[PDB]
A paper describes a structure:
The β-lactamase-catalysed hydrolysis of β-lactam antibiotics (BLAs) is of central importance in antibiotic resistance. The cyclic boronates act as ‘transition state analogues' for both ‘serine' and ‘metallo' enzymes and therefore represent a promising strategy for combating antibiotic resistance. The combined results reveal that cyclic boronates act as dual action inhibitors of SBLs and MBLs by mimicking a common high-energy tetrahedral intermediate; they also reveal that cyclic boronates can potently inhibit some PBPs via the same mechanism.
Hence, analogous to our structural observations with the VIM-2 and BcII MBLs (above), the OXA-10:1 complex structure reveals that 1 mimics the mechanistically important tetrahedral oxyanion that is transiently present on the hydrolytic pathway. Finally, the endocyclic boronate ester oxygen of 1 and the β-lactam-derived nitrogen (from the penicillin thiazolidine ring) are both positioned to hydrogen bond with Ser115.
Author numbering:
A (entry chain A): 19 to 264
B (entry chain B): 19 to 265
The structure:
Amino acid sequence: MGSITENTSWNKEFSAEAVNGVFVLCKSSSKSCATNDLARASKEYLPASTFKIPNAIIGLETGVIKNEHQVFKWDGKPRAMKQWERDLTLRGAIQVSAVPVFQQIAREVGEVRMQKYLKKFSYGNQNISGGIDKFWLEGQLRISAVNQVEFLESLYLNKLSASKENQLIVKEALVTEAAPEYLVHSKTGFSGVGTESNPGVAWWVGWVEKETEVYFFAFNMDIDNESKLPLRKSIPTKIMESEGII
Amino acid sequence: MGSITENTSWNKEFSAEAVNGVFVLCKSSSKSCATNDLARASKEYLPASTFKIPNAIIGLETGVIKNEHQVFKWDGKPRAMKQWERDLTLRGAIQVSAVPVFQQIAREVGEVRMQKYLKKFSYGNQNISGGIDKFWLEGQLRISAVNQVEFLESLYLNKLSASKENQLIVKEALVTEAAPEYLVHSKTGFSGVGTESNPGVAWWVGWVEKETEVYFFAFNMDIDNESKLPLRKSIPTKIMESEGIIG
Ligand SMILES: *[B@@]1([O])OC2=C(C([O])=O)[C]=[C][C]=C2[C][C]1[N]C(=O)[C]1[C][C][C][C][C]1
Ligand SMILES: *[B@@]1([O])OC2=C(C([O])=O)[C]=[C][C]=C2[C][C]1[N]C(=O)[C]1[C][C][C][C][C]1
Ligand SMILES: [Cl-]
Ligand code: NA
């Protein structure tokens, strides 16, 4: 990751909504990043569903996910969101953030291989304590916005310690907007509303390919009410629009 | 490819517009396809810019295209479309159908390796006569809608005779619509307007992933006027909407 400079002017998009959070934006060609809050940019938080990115790669690497067209069948038993109550492709399970699919992937990966790949990926504090099926949701794993950008830059370049094939598979699964000269890869996360004095976290991470430029981004915010969740996309979108990226 | 059945009811979407053409639609789970015109479905036409799909794969396989993120720089000399007068990524050059980028790729691949890979890919009549940089636009290469579907089905499954990595690279470059439970990969082609009695050809080929289903499609039509070109998407889109796919 390049140098990073604090630009406190981006705080305008945050104060307008009374949000405590951070945005990190890096422009690949210039090896330079900017953030509204240097200290928070390095602060580590639960990854929540952003962990679907490494978990998918690891599932493929270990053979738990058999290939890019594996279907994850629904057993017909209640799941916490109706959007999850159906058979899913890998891309579908990522896009609708289907926790139970990824919990079973994690169980089958198992703790040894999971620890091994988080080391290889330099993924946050690499702490998988708290149960193999939940450490990224309610356990001790933490990652910063800076580290998310670093991880995504490696993924973009196919430089993670995993096959290029499996990195490409997960990349296509992360596409969220496609136009002739504009392509977005992204992933949301949301840990919940937290507890008294201890808010939850909401994330949006990804990158934008516009013409021949690439912009890597990571956003997180404190959240204690689900009604604020749209801000996790609207604040970074407004910043990126102000930068002319869109 | 699975079975194929002629459905003449789809002809309503063509006759309403006075278009001579064919649509082939295959549903993966049922290994079954339908078409408005079985004979035309097997008839071979110039691929035009649909050839960017194999050409891109071959460019990567031979190392002419260095990797996924190679930039094709514009030398500043006039090109046939303003949309091509800029540096392009591989996806960009595919999506805007930048002919001069792919002519240079083809020249560097060369006739021998090009011929080898079109045999490996079972790509139409495999006839690359007419100049290494022009055979798919004005030469003797021809491919049918059925063969386009077969080729795309192989690409979807990473079963072409090329690395899995290079097949995946070209697949992401073909994405044209992305939603949480709906994803489209597609490529247009247009050979020109030809003449009266020797019309050009226009194509739309690709596939749709909707929930856990996959629908492969190929459309072509005769075209003698550039103003008709939008039909190359609107006819297949209306058929796929009528099928409940939407597209
Ligand atoms: B995950 O963090 O992603 C997610 C999102 C999102 O990312 O914005 C929104 C709704 C559900 C999910 C699934 C994952 N989050 C959770 O498991 C979380 C849901 C709310 C209760 C606490 C657990
Ligand atoms: B190619 O066939 O793709 C294309 C399309 C399309 O895909 O439908 C539309 C406009 C331009 C192009 C570039 C390629 N076609 C040509 O180069 C062709 C355009 C008309 C005159 C003869 C050359
Ligand atoms: Cl659940
Ligand atoms: Na089929």
